[PDB]
Design a protein around this ligand. Structure first.
Ligand SMILES: Nc1nc(=O)c2ncn([C@@H]3O[C@@H]4COP(=O)(O)O[C@H]5[C@@H](O)[C@H](n6cnc7c(N)ncnc76)O[C@@H]5COP(=O)(O)O[C@@H]3[C@@H]4O)c2[nH]1
Ligand SMILES: Nc1nc(=O)c2ncn([C@@H]3O[C@@H]4COP(=O)(O)O[C@H]5[C@@H](O)[C@H](n6cnc7c(N)ncnc76)O[C@@H]5COP(=O)(O)O[C@@H]3[C@@H]4O)c2[nH]1
Ligand SMILES: Nc1nc(=O)c2ncn([C@@H]3O[C@@H]4COP(=O)(O)O[C@H]5[C@@H](O)[C@H](n6cnc7c(N)ncnc76)O[C@@H]5COP(=O)(O)O[C@@H]3[C@@H]4O)c2[nH]1
Ligand SMILES: Nc1nc(=O)c2ncn([C@@H]3O[C@@H]4COP(=O)(O)O[C@H]5[C@@H](O)[C@H](n6cnc7c(N)ncnc76)O[C@@H]5COP(=O)(O)O[C@@H]3[C@@H]4O)c2[nH]1
Ligand SMILES: Nc1nc(=O)c2ncn([C@@H]3O[C@@H]4COP(=O)(O)O[C@H]5[C@@H](O)[C@H](n6cnc7c(N)ncnc76)O[C@@H]5COP(=O)(O)O[C@@H]3[C@@H]4O)c2[nH]1
Ligand SMILES: Nc1nc(=O)c2ncn([C@@H]3O[C@@H]4COP(=O)(O)O[C@H]5[C@@H](O)[C@H](n6cnc7c(N)ncnc76)O[C@@H]5COP(=O)(O)O[C@@H]3[C@@H]4O)c2[nH]1
Lengths: 124, 124, 124, 124, 124, 124
């Protein structure tokens, strides 16, 4: 189906699913994170929807939402916090460095698209 | 301020804020992503809350929520989609490799923790 | 020759040679590491053959042997040992991180091939 | 025990064990790779030993053996061959780049040591 | 135009400009660095030209000059100094690792071109 | 020794030399790059000085000059050109990616300092 195959294979808290159809650029713009667990009453402990910006912000017709950069900045902030606290680890430091370099490349993309004046249009 | 200082400085679609207080491990467990734009009535175009798992999933008193690798798996899937579509870029390729290596390091944490019998406990 | 061109060009303890013919996947499955030095009597100081698994382990026809992740795990263990000991270095630290990321990618390969039910088969 | 905890968790062909005790720098200098499979007589399908250089090469009393870059050069050559063949993969490319960068850092160590005149000597 | 589009966008000390014509390999071989500030007289605080080797050193007619690894070695030395000094930062440490790895890859290029017996020639 | 211990050891075209004294932050602010070869009168074929910014630009009293990121942007531009031309190489591609990531970390430093109000001051 549309349940994501993840790099983590054991002890997974949640599954992630694509919602809707492929949209601009070939990607999905809505996802659900839902728990692999249940309460005693049978509903999901976790059922969170994430909508991404689909179409440009400057247009009302567009689905306004989050961008990849926001999620990574959240994860970065939490990792910096965890490293400053009592349960730090070398794995956290390595993950954090990769998260920040991914963030830098995404920012490199936005800036390149500004220089070429293509930010916000459906063009390579 | 609780607004996060992000790597991206220009043309930001959204602002990210920590919500609540630092808790287990020294990290925040809820964040809000909100638009830098507003609608006619003056309401936000995007006002998205993300809640993270706080406390072990087995326990009912615990706040159940997402984990960081879910967010990165979403971003990873979207980057793979974009790279297969008409708007690919070398910047995407580098961001994607870093996102996957961050995911691989996070998995390494879970596996080390399983090996040491500390998964799900407040211990290094 | 079939001697391997190495990244280290100076003060090399040993030379490495490819042994045999290429086979499955375009690769060789036996190697010899021999010292660049001879003893008081003229015999080689070091002469190791390393045989790799050739064909699936589950088939009786196969040349059973080692796989690359085994060698890398040995090197990882030795580098971690050296870093915990009195002769640590930053060069060791950089090497160690790359060896671990190579292992993580080799394992990604294994997990992908299991997911697609192709592990142990001659299929891309 | 002396069994190494590896990054790979599923479908492991072999196990690696440390042999003996700590030597110079805090590392072990002999390892065994043995299959997780056995023949009819209960003998190992694979049992191979790798011995590392312990003590400087010139001193003749030293335990002469392989060095880590020899193993990494083998793995690098095999990965290059696989990438040229029909069973290539992106995981192979990422692993190969990391293996090569580990080799480049191992050479850098050697070159610094030659420069500081401390090669072959038990000195940081 | 002729001005380089740089990764740094705010508080830039200087501008970098391409000088002259496209040359061997498709690159430019003269660059100019000039301050974004000017003095009381209206003259530039900085106006520095860097010429690069265009053509082989052995031939007299060719423009003798610097090579890129020279510039990176200077930056590496300065970064090592700053890391030993009071104004170190994690950003400096990451930049330094990348500069050294870029240098090592430039050294791979030199070493390979030696081995294929093409160093100093206009050949792929 | 004010001469630089470089990563390339063979077939070097130029030598790089420290000029002047240790300065602010513990680093050198002038360097000379000189040809290993010779002009018939005996002057060096290449002899070029690069002076770095020492002290803040606004202060007239400072030594005005180039900054490290200027040199890396030149090298980046040359690497991108070479990769678009007939003499590309995989070594160039890796070198270029590392040069861009070093530049991004240097810009990450400038921004952090701006944020904390220390840019242009002698403080972390
Ligand atoms: N102002 C602003 N700041 C940003 O940081 C930013 N990041 C993305 N966007 C814009 O959001 C809108 C929603 O994206 P959509 O999926 O509809 O189209 C996207 C998507 O189909 C595709 N694409 C390819 N790679 C990526 C990528 N890495 N991130 C986002 N979109 C990508 O290429 C289209 C145009 O991208 P941008 O040209 O970045 O403009 C987008 C677009 O206007 C931004 N707008
Ligand atoms: N089954 C399962 N699979 C996972 O992948 C996973 N990841 C986290 N958890 C558990 O979720 C719960 C919520 O985390 P909390 O913040 O309360 O405590 C966490 C947090 O305070 C801190 N910590 C340090 N680094 C990290 C990190 N990278 N990710 C998460 N938590 C981290 O260290 C505590 C214990 O961590 P785990 O020992 O992984 O167990 C956690 C915990 O039981 C998981 N549980
Ligand atoms: N159980 C198990 N766990 C492992 O970790 C593992 N790693 C490899 N193998 C299997 O060993 C046997 C020996 O490899 P051979 O060279 O004949 O064929 C290999 C080889 O020709 C080629 N190949 C391509 N890339 C690689 C690679 N990175 N490592 C090994 N083989 C590779 O692709 C074939 C199939 O690979 P796998 O599909 O991984 O199955 C192999 C095969 O059955 C494993 N088997
Ligand atoms: N000629 C030559 N070329 C090489 O590439 C090379 N690599 C290692 N050696 C020498 O092999 C001998 C066996 O190592 P031992 O474990 O006894 O001591 C080692 C070991 O205890 C420790 N050490 C710390 N980090 C490393 C490391 N990365 N690799 C090897 N040894 C290391 O630090 C000691 C001295 O290292 P070198 O100073 O390189 O000399 C060694 C030593 O004489 C080499 N000799
Ligand atoms: N002795 C010596 N040691 C070095 O480290 C070195 N690095 C470069 N050179 C030689 O300098 C001269 C000036 O370069 P030019 O632009 O004219 O030609 C270059 C240039 O057009 C192109 N090229 C492609 N990638 C690169 C690259 N990464 N660095 C330099 N030149 C490159 O490919 C041509 C041949 O390169 P080399 O084959 O390395 O020989 C060069 C050449 O003789 C060197 N010479
Ligand atoms: N406007 C502006 N844009 C820039 O990109 C920039 N980069 C540097 N500078 C300023 O140039 C001046 C010359 O540097 P100096 O060596 O005297 O002091 C420097 C130097 O001694 C030390 N330092 C530590 N790490 C670095 C580094 N990576 N690059 C440069 N200097 C560094 O820390 C001091 C303060 O650095 P900044 O706080 O960036 O301010 C510098 C300084 O005012 C800049 N000014």
């Amino acid at each position: 189906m549309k349940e994501l195959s993840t790099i983590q294979k054991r002890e997974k808290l949640n599954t992630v699913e694509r919602i809707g159809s492929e949209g601009p650029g070939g990607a999905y713009h809505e996802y659900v994170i839902k728990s692999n667990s249940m309460d005693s009453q049978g509903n999901y402990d976790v059922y969170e929807t994430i909508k991404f910006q689909k179409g440009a912000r400057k247009e009302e017709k567009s689905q306004h939402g989050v961008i990849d950069s926001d999620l990574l900045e959240i994860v970065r902030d939490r990792l910096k916090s965890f490293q400053a606290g009592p349960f730090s680890s070398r794995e956290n430091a390595c993950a954090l460095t990769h998260v920040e370099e991914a963030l830098m490349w995404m920012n490199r993309r936005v800036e390149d698209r500004i220089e070429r004046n293509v930010l916000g249009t459906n063009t390579k």
